[PDB]
């Protein structure tokens, strides 16, 4: 109390504007709040999670409501290839008449934004057909969010607040969140697909008013109990099936066709249903592994303690990891963030190659937006995982409880890890940049025949192993006389091979020297970002320059100019530096994906194969060439629908540049300037009446680095989003 | 429907932020509790 931030007496007593700024940046760091205990920490985290779930569900309900109320979902489902999905109306009083006329598209009769989220395709695939269904879903989600908000309030009452032992009941949590949250949820989703999505795709309207009397399969659970499950695979949808209608429709609900639906160029709904049924079964079985007051099950502490190889190469093995993980929220938060980042990358990599949604992969802008979105989120999640691991080392690691432990041995040979990571990064960077510059130079001198074009033999070999009969390797599924192909020949090999060998797909795009060089650049980026983050995490507890770094916390500005200078020595500074590399590598990945897909869509993939071997090709044939429809969003001759994207492009450039202001110029100059500003204000008549209550000071060093990084990131993301959306939507590629 | 945006967008973009910033300014520098 006594001022704005209650959770910090030190900040509360601060007389400057700093009190405000830090008051915002320390709010969610519950550990540091004054008079904070473990139990209250856990309960506050629980309530905050309830609130976050409510926010997510309200966001989803808003999307559904806006599409239902202002979208053209019915028109789109009628003709989903030619019309453009609508996001929401544009009521902007700042628009001029030509702008209103220009942004009127799709259904028209009002200014409107064309949705690039792909939610239309997803909702159409899952069986929704009318605005009424979207509205009902949104109302249900609003009610669910209200329920979650009430639950969050309720679990803060003294008689309903769960005890501390309840939170640390790892076994029961794992059991329920595996069998229940993952498995039963997947079982329910496959039930939906069988009961709603598939019948809706076959022209039959199933809804809440009739889903209890129309069984999804004519036999109706008789084969299931009798054991004749094959019945559910018989009579699949023939290739001449018009999605959403009974023309060429089948009756199977669980098949393993593989490949893609010819009309929608997406996965078969029955394949998804069978997939999710199998996943639900596996997760439900997995959730019965740990004991919860029922005698049977595993005790995880014993498991961790028992895995110490007798060879002694791991020292004490995993002894003491159970206590560190259960007692430290930062370690488990980092683990969860890392796994989520890997999964986000996996979704980005798999949705584009294996299209799950009907009529997607023809809405190019949506695919590009989704891929870029999920890759950037994956990068953010990975950086966060490593940052929270550094935090764990700073304030949660107990070297006495991890003596000779695997985790302790990680710090024991940290020098080797960091040095070999540095060697790999230097090797990759040196040589990849050298090859790129060599190609640039030879092509510049009109001698393209001298380029070092390296064929990605290993990636092409992998593609052949899956059935890519284009490189002539004759290995595994690419050779008929192989155990793999014959064993799989009956179930899914025909459809999968038909899909992979067809060049009208994203399944295993053909690759060449350009793909090789870009993949090595990506490896460089990943290795360098990992080097930065791992160095920060391992040196978080101290270095030769600061052997007592752990005593100064996770985020401190420096240790003064003494003994050589110690700018950016804290682990938080390692995260701040690694954020730039994360952005750079994700940008490389997204540039590679977008350019390859743009060239494929245009119908001249040779352009990429030719111009991706030297950097001038990237600068000319990708950035310079594809930005023409973007920068022409508004010219003195007029404007078109892309004007907003061009404006956002320039805006992102401006924010990116503004970030340099905080990243280059540091505090002392600005503090000395604010001194003169204060003097000037205090010595002005008619303005001496108005006096600040908080003394105005320059931003702190760490705050300034954070703000510069935030501007850098916001500008980066906005400009690249504008480019990727506008180019694709302007050239339809 | 077709009338709400006119009513709400000004409230959400002008009135709501104005009142919110007024209250936050009052609370930040309240000097008590």
């Amino acid at each position: 109390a006594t001022k704005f931030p209650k959770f910090s007496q030190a900040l509360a007593q601060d007389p400057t504007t700093r009190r405000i700024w830090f008051g915002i940046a320390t709010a969610h760091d519950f550990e540091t709040h004054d008079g904070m205990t473990e139990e209250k920490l856990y309960q506050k985290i629980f309530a905050s999670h309830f609130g976050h779930l409510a926010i997510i569900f309200l966001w989803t309900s808003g999307n559904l409501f806006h599409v239902a109320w202002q979208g053209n979902f019915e028109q789109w489902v009628l003709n989903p290839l030619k019309v453009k999905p609508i996001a929401h109306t544009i009521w902007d009083p700042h628009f001029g008449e030509p702008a209103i006329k220009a942004f009127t598209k799709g259904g028209a009769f009002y200014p409107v934004n064309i949705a690039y989220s792909g939610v239309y395709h997803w909702w159409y695939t899952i069986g929704m057909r009318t605005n009424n269904d979207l509205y009902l879903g949104s109302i249900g989600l609003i009610i669910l969010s209200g329920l979650l908000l009430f639950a969050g309030w309720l679990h803060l009452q003294p008689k309903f607040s769960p005890s501390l032992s309840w939170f640390k009941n790892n076994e029961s949590r794992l059991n329920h969140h595996l069998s229940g949250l993952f498995g039963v949820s997947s079982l329910a989703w496959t039930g939906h697909l069988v009961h709603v999505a598939i019948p809706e795709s076959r022209g039959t309207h199933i809804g809440w008013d009739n889903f209890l009397t129309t069984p999804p399969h004519p036999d109706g659970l008789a084969p299931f109990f009798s054991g004749n499950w094959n019945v559910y695979a018989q009579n699949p949808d023939t290739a001449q099936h018009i999605f959403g209608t009974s023309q060429g429709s089948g009756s199977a609900i669980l098949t393993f066709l593989g490949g893609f639906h010819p009309q929608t160029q997406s996965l078969w709904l029955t394949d998804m249903a069978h997939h999710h049924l199998a996943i639900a079964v596996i997760f439900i079985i997995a959730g019965h592994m740990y004991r919860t007051n029922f005698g049977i099950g595993h005790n995880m502490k014993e498991i961790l303690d028992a895995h110490r190889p007798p060879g002694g190469r791991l020292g004490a093995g995993h002894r003491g990891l159970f206590d560190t993980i259960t007692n430290s929220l930062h370690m488990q938060l980092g683990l969860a963030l890392a796994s989520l980042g890997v999964i986000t990358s996996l979704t980005a990599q798999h949705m584009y190659a294996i299209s799950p949604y009907a009529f997607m992969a023809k809405d190019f802008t949506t695919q590009a937006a989704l891929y870029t979105h999920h890759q950037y989120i994956a990068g953010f999640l990975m950086v966060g995982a490593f940052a929270h691991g550094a935090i764990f080392f700073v304030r949660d690691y107990d070297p006495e409880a991890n003596k000779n432990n695997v985790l302790a041995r990680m710090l024991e040979h940290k020098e080797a890890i960091i040095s070999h990571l540095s060697w790999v990064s230097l090797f990759l960077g040196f040589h990849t940049l050298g090859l790129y510059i060599h190609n640039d130079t030879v092509v510049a001198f009109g001698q393209p025949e001298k380029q070092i074009l390296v064929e990605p033999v290993f990636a092409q070999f992998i593609q052949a192993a899956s059935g890519k009969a284009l490189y002539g390797f004759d290995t595994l599924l690419s050779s008929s006389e192989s155990p793999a192909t014959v064993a799989g020949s009956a179930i899914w090999l025909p459809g999968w091979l038909e899909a992979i060998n067809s060049e009208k797909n994203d399944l295993f795009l053909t690759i060449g020297p350009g793909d090789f060089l870009v993949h090595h650049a990506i490896a460089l980026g990943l290795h360098t970002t990992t080097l930065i983050l791992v160095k920060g995490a391992l040196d978080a507890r101290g270095s030769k320059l600061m052997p007592d770094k752990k005593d100064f916390g996770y985020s401190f500005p420096c240790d003064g100019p003494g003994r050589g200078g110690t700018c950016d020595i804290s682990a938080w500074d390692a995260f701040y530096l690694s954020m730039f590399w994360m952005l750079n590598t994700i940008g490389w990945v997204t540039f590679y994906w977008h350019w390859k897909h743009v060239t494929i869509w245009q119908g001249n993939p040779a352009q990429f194969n030719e111009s991706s071997n030297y950097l001038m090709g990237w600068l000319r044939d990708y950035l310079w060439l594809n930005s023409s429809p973007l920068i022409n969003g508004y010219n003195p001759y007029g404007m078109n629908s892309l004007s907003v994207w061009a404006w956002m492009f320039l805006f992102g450039h401006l924010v990116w540049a503004t970030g340099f202001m905080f990243l280059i110029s540091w505090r002392g100059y600005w503090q000395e300037l604010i001194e003169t500003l204060v003097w000037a204000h205090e010595r002005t008549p008619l303005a001496n009446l108005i006096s600040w209550k908080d003394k105005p000071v320059a931003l702190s060093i760490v705050q300034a680095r954070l703000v510069g990084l935030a501007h850098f990131t916001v500008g980066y993301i906005l400009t690249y989003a504008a480019f990727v959306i506008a180019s694709t939507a302007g050239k339809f590629g | 429907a077709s009338y709400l945006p006119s009513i709400l967008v000004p409230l959400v973009g002008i009135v709501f932020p104005g009142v919110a910033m007024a209250l936050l300014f009052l609370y930040i520098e309240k000097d008590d509790i």
């Binding site: 209650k6 309530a47 009424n132 949104s138 109302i139 609003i142 908000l149 009430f150 803060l156 | -």
Partner: peptide, 30 residues
């Protein structure tokens, strides 16, 4: 094709949820 009644009841349920959010936040107790 959502009628004005549908929009109005959506707004009412949103208002109820907003009040619940107000109360939950208040209970997080700064």
């Amino acid at each position: 094709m959502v009628t004005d009644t549908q929009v109005f009841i959506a707004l009412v349920l949103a208002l109820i949820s907003a009040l619940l959010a107000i109360r939950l936040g208040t209970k997080l107790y700064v």
